[PDB]
């Protein structure tokens, strides 16, 4: 059973929908700025990718919204955009065949931090009654199903940077194997609180380029110093092909492959050859029935880390051989930063749009490619080119790897 993309939705540091975000991507625009919503003078990193000007009231009543952490509000916004974009009418004849898989890396950290402050100052009577339902990761899937009447498979992944990739891949598996005809899948993140910036800062994971936030995210650049923490959400409507065809749906692209692997190497550090990423990409290509030479575009994991970026080049060279010099690969995290559990979702949308528009997004900030970083990394400016097959990679903490493969639809 074939799986197509019929609807997409997004909040990112570049825009409050897909068209606005993609316009930013193609123009080489950074969404990274000093963070406004808290005082970070004690933190080593004081900048990130925030969602600008979000109005939850476009999606939910002020009543419903006050009960939900920002990561849920973001996930719901993306989901509602995707469902609307799909044109699907939910009925009694199909509602059991429509499910949801929206994940998060960290979930309701802001809500946890604020409730923790009330707990320590006052005691447990100050904890919100909506604290649990409004903070737990599966409540994007939960609330979406309730609002739209979706009675199909209902779950949530939490796999760090791989969350959105795994969410989409496993949703596509549900449709492929007949457990559902439609799935809303992707991920959401809002970890820009004291615990998030302080936590990743304590692990020395973040860029500390406070003087030039728009230059901080620089995948494959010799002066990269860690990732940029970013917020938002991505959602796709995945649909069985015959189901989509029958209702006259607009098909953006086909989801042809999903691969997974584990490094089984280290908690935060990748193998220097990227062997786990290599296995993952090969698993996805095998799943899609594609040779490496059929790949035209890779949306890289490319988080702007010393070890991670070079390991991904190594894995691409291993998988693609001489064809590694013919494909284009870029990291849109150059512009968006690292959306953690949303990264795979937004990057899947950017991969589908590279197929729609026949354009490889840039890697901005790639001033001085490091040793070995000699592929077409689409430095600086978008590249019009032929793109039949687009791959999206995500490699998360714990060495958990996921690859999606999208194809132009015939
Ligand atoms: C986090 C930092 C302090 C340490 C380190 O520099 C880093 O970036 N580790 C990244 C992980 C994700 N994996 C990859 O990037 C990757 C590339 C090729 N194959 N895997 C390994 C587990 C997280
Ligand atoms: Cl370890």
Rounded Cα–Cα distance for residues 70 and 23 (Å): 24
Rounded Cα–Cα distance for residues 342 and 347 (Å): 8
Q: Determine contact, residues 194/113, Cβ cutoff 8 Å.
A: yes
Tokens of 357: 């528009």
Q: Pairing mode, if any, of strands 47-49 and 32-34?
A: antiparallel
SS3 string, the chain, reads CCEEEEEEEEEECCECCHHHHHHHHHCCCCCEEECCCCCCCCCCCCEEECCCCCCHHHCCCHHHHHCCCHHHHHHHHHHHHHHHHHCCCCCCCCHHHEEEEEECCCCCHHHHHHHHHHHHHCCHHHCCCCCCCCCCCCHHHHHHHHHHCCCCCEECCCCHHHHHHHHHHHHHHHHHCCCCCEEEEEEEECCCCHHHHHHHHHCCCECCCCCCHHHCCCCCECCCCCECEECEEEEEEEEEHHHHHHCCCCCCEEEEEEEEEECCCCCCCCCCCCHHHHHHHHHHHHHHCCCHHHCCEEECCCCCCHHHHHHHHHHHHHHHHHHHHCCEEECCHHHHCECHHHHHHHHHHHHHHHHHHCEECCECCCCCECCCCCCECCECCCEECCCCEEEEEEEECCCEEEEEEEECCC
Task: Please identify which residue in the block is written with the tokens 């019009």.
Answer: 384
Q: CB neighbours (10 Å) of residue 126?
A: 12
* Equal CATH topology for 3-246 and 259-407: yes
Tokens of 79: 């989901």
Rounded Cα–Cα distance for residues 307 and 295 (Å): 25
Who contacts 109 (Cβ-Cβ below 8 Å, separation ≥6)?
71, 190, 191, 193, 195, 196
Pocket test for ligand 1, best of 218, 304, 395, 400 (most atoms within 8 A of CB): 395
Tokens of 170: 């496993």
Q: Determine contact, residues 315/277, Cβ cutoff 8 Å.
A: yes
Tokens of 213: 């936030």
Tell me the ligand closest to 265's alpha carbon.
Answer: 2
Tell me the ligand closest to 271's alpha carbon.
Answer: 1
For the CA of 278, the nearest atom of ligand 1 = 19
Ligand 2 centre from 346 Cα, in Å?
A: 29
Domain range list for the chain: 3-246, 259-407
Pocket test for ligand 1, best of 217, 267, 308 (most atoms within 8 A of CB): 308
Tokens of 26: 């193609």
Instruction: Kindly list the protein residues whose Cβ atom lies closer than 6 A to any atom of ligand 1.
Output: 203-205, 268-270, 274, 276-277, 301, 305-308, 311-312, 315, 395, 397, 399
CATH code reported for the domain at 3-246: 3.40.47.10
CATH 3.40.47.10 fits 259-407, yes or no: yes
Q: CB neighbours (10 Å) of residue 390?
A: 28
Resolution in A: 1.8
Q: CB neighbours (10 Å) of residue 17?
A: 16
Q: Which residues pair with 154 in a beta bridge?
A: 100
Pocket test for ligand 1, best of 105, 270, 283, 309 (most atoms within 8 A of CB): 270
């Amino acid at each position: 059973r074939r799986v197509v993309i019929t609807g997409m939705g997004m909040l990112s540091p570049l825009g409050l929908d897909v068209p606005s975000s993609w316009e930013g991507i193609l123009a080489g625009r950074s969404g990274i700025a000093p963070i406004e919503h808290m005082d970070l003078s004690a933190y080593s990193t004081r900048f990130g990718g925030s969602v600008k000007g979000f109005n939850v009231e476009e999606y939910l009543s002020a009543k419903e919204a006050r009960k939900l952490d920002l990561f849920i509000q973001y996930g719901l916004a993306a989901s509602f955009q995707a469902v609307r974009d799909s044109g699907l009418e939910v009925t009694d004849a199909n509602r059991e065949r429509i499910g949801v898989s929206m994940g998060s890396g960290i979930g309701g950290l802001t809500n946890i931090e604020n409730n923790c402050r009330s707990l320590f100052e006052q005691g447990p009577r100050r904890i919100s009654p909506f604290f649990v339902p409004g903070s737990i990761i599966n409540m994007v899937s939960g609330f979406l199903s309730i609002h739209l009447g979706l009675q199909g498979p209902n779950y949530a992944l939490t796999t760090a940077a791989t969350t959105g990739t795994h969410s989409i891949g496993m949703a596509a598996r549900n449709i492929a194997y007949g457990e559902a005809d439609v799935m809303v899948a992707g991920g959401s993140e809002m970890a820009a609180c004291g615990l998030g910036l302080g936590g990743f800062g304590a692990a020395r994971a973040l860029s500390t380029r406070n003087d030039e936030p728009t230059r901080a995210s620089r995948p494959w650049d010799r002066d990269r110093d860690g990732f940029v923490l970013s917020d938002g959400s991505g959602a796709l409507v995945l649909e069985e092909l015959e189901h989509a065809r029958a209702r006259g749906a607009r098909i953006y692209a086909e989801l042809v492959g999903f691969g997974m692997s584990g490094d089984a190497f280290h908690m935060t550090a990748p193998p220097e050859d990227g062997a786990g990423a290599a296995r993952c990409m090969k698993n996805a290509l095998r799943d899609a029935g594609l040779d490496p030479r059929q790949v035209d575009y890779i949306n890289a994991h490319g988080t702007s880390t010393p070890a991670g970026d070079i390991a991904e080049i190594a894995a691409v060279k291993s998988v693609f051989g001489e064809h590694a010099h013919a494909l284009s690969m870029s990291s849109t995290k150059s512009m968006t930063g690292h959306l953690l559990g949303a990264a795979g979702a937004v990057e899947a949308i950017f991969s589908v749009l590279a197929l729609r528009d026949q354009v490889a997004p840039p890697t901005i900030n790639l001033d001085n490619p490091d040793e070995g970083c000699d592929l077409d990394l689409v430095a600086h400016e978008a590249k019009p080119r032929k793109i039949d097959v687009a791959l999206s990679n995500s490699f998360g903490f714990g060495g958990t790897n996921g690859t999606l493969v999208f194809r132009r639809f015939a």
